[PDB]
A paper describes a structure:
Here, we present the crystal structure of [name] thiolase (CaTHL), a type II biosynthetic thiolase that catalyses the first step of n-butanol biosynthesis and condenses two acetyl-CoAs to acetoacetyl-CoA. We reveal that CaTHL, unlike other type II biosynthetic thiolases from aerobic bacteria, is regulated via modulation of a redox-switch, indicating that n-butanol production and the relevant metabolic fluxes in Clostridium are tightly regulated by thiolase. CaTHL consists of three domains: an N-terminal α/β domain (N-domain, residues 1–119 and 249–269), a loop domain (L-domain, residues 120–248), and a C-terminal α/β domain (C-domain, residues 270–392). The N- and C-domains form a typical five-layered fold (α–β–α–β–α) observed in other thiolase superfamily of proteins including peroxisomal degradative thiolase from Saccharomyces cerevisiae, β-ketoacyl synthase II from E. coli, and the biosynthetic thiolase from Zoogloea ramigera (ZrTHL)14151617181920.
Numbering used by the authors:
A (entry chain A), B (entry chain B): 1 to 392
The structure:
Amino acid sequence: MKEVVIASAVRTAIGSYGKSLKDVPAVDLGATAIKEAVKKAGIKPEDVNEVILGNVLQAGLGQNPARQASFKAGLPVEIPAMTINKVCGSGLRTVSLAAQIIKAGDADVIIAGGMENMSRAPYLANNARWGYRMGNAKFVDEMITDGLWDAFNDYHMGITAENIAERWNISREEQDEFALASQKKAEEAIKSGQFKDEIVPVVIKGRKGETVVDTDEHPRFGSTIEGLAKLKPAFKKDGTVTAGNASGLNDCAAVLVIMSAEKAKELGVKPLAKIVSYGSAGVDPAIMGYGPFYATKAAIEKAGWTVDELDLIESNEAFAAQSLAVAKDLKFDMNKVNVNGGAIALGHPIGASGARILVTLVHAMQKRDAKKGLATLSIGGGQGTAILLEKC
Amino acid sequence: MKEVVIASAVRTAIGSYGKSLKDVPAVDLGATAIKEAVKKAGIKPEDVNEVILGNVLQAGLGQNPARQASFKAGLPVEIPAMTINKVCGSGLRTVSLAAQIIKAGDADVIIAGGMENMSRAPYLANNARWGYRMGNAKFVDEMITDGLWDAFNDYHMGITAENIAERWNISREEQDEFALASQKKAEEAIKSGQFKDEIVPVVIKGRKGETVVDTDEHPRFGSTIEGLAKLKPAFKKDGTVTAGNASGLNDCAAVLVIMSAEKAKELGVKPLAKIVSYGSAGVDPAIMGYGPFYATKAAIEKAGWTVDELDLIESNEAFAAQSLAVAKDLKFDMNKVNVNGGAIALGHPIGASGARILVTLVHAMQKRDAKKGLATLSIGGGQGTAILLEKC
Ligand SMILES: CC(C)(COP(=O)(O)OP(=O)(O)OC[C@H]1O[C@@H](n2cnc3c(N)ncnc32)[C@H](O)[C@@H]1OP(=O)(O)O)[C@@H](O)C(=O)NCCC(=O)NCCS
Ligand SMILES: CC(C)(COP(=O)(O)OP(=O)(O)OC[C@H]1O[C@@H](n2cnc3c(N)ncnc32)[C@H](O)[C@@H]1OP(=O)(O)O)[C@@H](O)C(=O)NCCC(=O)NCCS
């Protein structure tokens, strides 16, 4: 097989629900990231063979959101594009799909990653076409239905976290301590400039002014264990899961240029990392948060690695409960996990999230000179996906 | 690299808008086709490595429609799934994506295809979440916006068909004659049993009864040139494109089992066709209907074939105008094109359409003993995709 590398890795800041990125469509976040990713790779727009982007809340975004992001980015109309939906895994899975297509001999350069604007999701009327006839009906929150609700069990993803808290015996306190540690890591990383290299600014041009968004806004600086302990349960009576130990609803795009090592050499690109292996797996939807266990095991086996060999790990924090279960069973050294904070603090912009963690991983590997890295995350509907990277 | 084969190919009947399959969600049509494809292929569900399905109108369908179809088919939960949106080409692109993943060394057996229920598309309120504040707004038809409207030029796909008609001087009369020919061929094919081997019946459990849908209902038997000439332009004043010479809005699923030739031999499968090559291409969105010209050329070049070596062709009839343009420029022998009718008569269920013409092609190739086949179609947003088959 051809070897496959990451040439550049870029993301917008992660905006909070209804806040900083509320007026910026997902496809415009995506275009902002694409332009800057192409520029950071040091290639020309004409060098890209395909665009593959994750997006989950596609409702009313218009034909083929990936194609829209591409066009708005200045990429030639000649380049094909497609939009992938694997829920939370979308943005990570496009990167392994890119690797697969390159290994198949069909391209040398692919723009991958994902984009999401949860703040902009519509409401739906399911029976307006042919009519309600009589009686009240549901005005459906598309964000919940398309992104956050289990289609088999008829409950919120937060209930899948409670299921994991119950079965693995992970206490509210353990969940709150994990959340607090993520907040503290995120604050320290932001203030020490760890994200400065990876974040492309988004310029919001209104009728009257320009505003620049370039800082993650979701973290709660000065978080305390007492603050967390007082929070009410978010999903069920007497639940362990709360807004403080669950990831948020957020807006972001994150994009990587993926290439064959031989194309990168030819074009003078200095790659950030090699994509070593990857894997995807399914699990019972009721415990979807455990998906990364199987996906990580598959990818590691494929690579001929072990977990102990890993230098840095990004394991997406959909919920403390599930992150803890996964870490425990994979026996992670928690000092190597989400060293710049995770999604409890930073947010979870579902379509983008997988790509966002990989962006974060590859920049952290460069800065810390770490040789081997893992990114993996859980997927609503009962899946996991993972990618292993090696420094070039 | 590994050789890639099609082990089975099945579709539901194509229902008309608001009619026979109005009460059957896309994911249920998909599940129906998946179960029958796995059966026809002669494999176990546990031999399947991934499910990759096209679906365009995802709004309110719940998390990850491909996973839902996979789950409702009875496939084991350990199998991963993802949903692809490349508009009209979604269903065909999943097949070449499967071939790429297999060629990459990452799987041996993939369920691919597409599913769509256009009758069931919701209406949307885009600003219900944070408020309209004041003034009337749009109650958005999600089928139009997500499937049929150009995101760049702000007009219907039918206007892209007028554009081609104007550029190429394809007259109303020429479009109507092409339409009539498609209708006659579909009638002949339906009545002569050509679609019997490929159609899986859909069993609808109504309160009143149990009903079975197993026949394509869109064709209009006894269509006449005079009947076509009386129709009004559907998209612009004094236009050439009408309801009669455009494809319809339709509901269907079409699924294929794709495997390495090595695995097929190990499992005792007798394949239907080898996948020889494939391609995708982008064009200006305004002339999207021309996408197959470039896609087809790429595929044929990769294969080192020529157009005149083709024994059967399925070139999707999004509109008579664009089918006629692609056909003139690729120089097709029209007697080998859409021999069982095309989408003007049969319908165009967007996410499934590209898989549906591939199903139709492979069955037609076994019936007529043809050696080489091409499936190609246009994509809204200015793309094309194509697959080349050689009969085993
Ligand atoms: C949990 C959830 C319902 C909360 O949504 P919300 O009510 O809009 O959340 P908010 O961020 O507004 O938080 C509400 C209040 O909780 C409190 N809160 C949240 N995090 C806190 C923290 N670290 N410390 C103290 N208080 C906190 C605050 O009081 C906040 O009010 P404020 O913003 O005025 O201070 C939502 O984030 C959610 O659904 N998350 C899970 C997402 C998910 O399932 N993703 C898919 C994973 S597979
Ligand atoms: C053209 C379009 C708007 C028509 O929608 P519609 O009005 O719902 O179409 P209908 O099937 O109801 O047809 C309307 C009337 O036209 C007439 N008609 C359609 N096909 C006909 C034919 N072969 N002969 C005679 N009359 C015909 C009929 O009178 C019909 O009324 P009836 O069924 O009551 O007899 C719709 O099919 C469309 O938008 N098609 C294009 C889809 C598209 O763009 N797809 C994407 C491609 S990239």
